[PDB]
Amino acid sequence: AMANNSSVANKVCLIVIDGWGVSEDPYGNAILNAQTPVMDKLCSGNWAQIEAHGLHVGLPEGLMGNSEVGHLNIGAGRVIYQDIVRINLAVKNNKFVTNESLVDACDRAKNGNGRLHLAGLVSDGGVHSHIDHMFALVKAIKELGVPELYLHFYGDGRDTSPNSGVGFLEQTLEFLEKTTGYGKLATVVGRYYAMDRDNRWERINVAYEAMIGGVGETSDEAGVVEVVRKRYAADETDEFLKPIILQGEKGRVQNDDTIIFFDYRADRMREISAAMGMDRYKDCNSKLAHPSNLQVYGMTQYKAEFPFKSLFPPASNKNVLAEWLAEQKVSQFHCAETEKYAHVTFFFNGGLEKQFEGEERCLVPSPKVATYDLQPEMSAAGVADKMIEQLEAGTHPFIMCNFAPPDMVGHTGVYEAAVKACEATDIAIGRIYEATQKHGYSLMVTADHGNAEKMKAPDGGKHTAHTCYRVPLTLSHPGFKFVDPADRHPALCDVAPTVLAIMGLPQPAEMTGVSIVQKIKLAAALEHHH
């Protein structure tokens, strides 16, 4: 309990069904075909259908939802923009020129020796980086007036074809010469060397020595494409390119220089960046002197333990629903079975390991079976038992749980097991609903993304993946009606603001989602007057 528990206007029970989407196609639809009398009634009359995939949840367009992004967005009451989407918006809206950390790096060079370096994976792969981002960084660095800029090009061939690097190289040389007339290519080396993530420091050292000491094959703008073509003819592809060195000593990373890595994926940037900006140069075991007084920037955070500034640091995610309730001195209960326990804690609470004051947690063991189609009800009954006990106690004005079966059995692709998974989930929901009506809670049921509504591909084969269908949002309180947002479809970012509105609690400014309910009285005044 917490001091302000009695300030709530309505106690809310939020059920997050995992992998339960809304689809009218009955073919392979384990939810429609399953016996689901409870959800058939809850998903009738006053209910909503909200988006849980793609840009609606901060993911690239067309990408299916998932449990991590879904519980994050439900908990946060805002769209958390995934790195790719976030950076692409910045490029589209010319925001690099005013990026705080980019301006910082350019100010360091300008107030210092004038020298700045860009290093990363140069291709349109989009897994670790994108060449478009590197081009946008060059244009912004130029506009910001940095005296000297050098590019260290890491060859891909893994996220793109093994002989595409020559094209990205040609694109880059022409961009630097004709488009910007500013910036110089200094190194080409394959990601096998620059981007190791297995502590093979002898590979990092090849990239390190190329960048620091120009250890590699000397070439120039006129000759470098031909060098690469000769490498290709010798079966040395992009991923494995041995270093090519341009600009001589001036293009090396020297004392007092500043360096930006443009990859947004951290795992393969940790080693080279720590070699440059911390003490792991020792691990490279090189005879070359390490340059003094370097400053390293990353496109994103590579490790919290690193001193590096980031162009796009993590969303602060202040005042997610779980933090906000605690700040309002309202207690709460989060319950899941083992397979989804992280989702109702780490992910729901904002994507970090933090338990807020007044937050009580409950883990129900998942069944110990080889695969979950062998016990499709999983432990949904136990989760409902624990929620029902909290409803009877009345201690917590906000309680929430996850039901795992639809998602976890959905992944087995076994249609008949998925049907039973949904039947057991519906039974559990019904038991919670009856308890909320007995004990004075409002019930809201939603999901984190779809899965079980699509168990068959069109050819009749198994479908084991999440989906892009909408998810339900239900509400048992008859004093409210659902209303969609003005300018977009409702989405998972609208769940937490809606909870707060029903609970009669303030909404923090950090929640940029909107409540998608309206009190009937207020709707009635709006009708008769407008």
């Binding site: 901060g58 991590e68 994926r265 951290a266 955070q301 490790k303 970090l352």
Partner: peptide
């Protein structure tokens, strides 16, 4: 998994 919005959230 290291920060909200990182690459693992794509899956």
């Amino acid at each position: 998994x290291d920060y909200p919005g990182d690459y693992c959230y794509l899956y």
